């Protein structure tokens, strides 16, 4: 097979130079509507606390 | 005790150092997890009116 008892599984890769075919599947990148960030500024910030 | 113009009921108490005898209880104490405390400072004071 083989040759290493116990026998194992041998599959063969493809060079990364060259596939050439492979299941190629255009991905449709999908999310939600309306980002936003917005600033919040405290009240009742001091110099010795802040919330 | 039925010796006065109108009859009156009686009960019995006992002295403060002997009971020495009625049903006691354990009576354990629940309260929220988690109290906390914070100094909410001023949110604009001023000379003439702070708030």
Known sequence: MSNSAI???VVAVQE???EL???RTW????GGQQV???PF???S???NQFN
Chains 1, 2 share one sequence.
């Open 16 to 18: 990364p130079r060259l």
């Open 27 to 30: 991905v449709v990148v999908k």
């Open 45 to 47: 910030f001091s110099s």
């Open 36 to 38: 936003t960030y917005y």
């Open 7 to 9: 026998p194992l599984n």
């Open 41 to 43: 500024p405290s009240t």
């Open 21 to 23: 075919n492979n299941e």
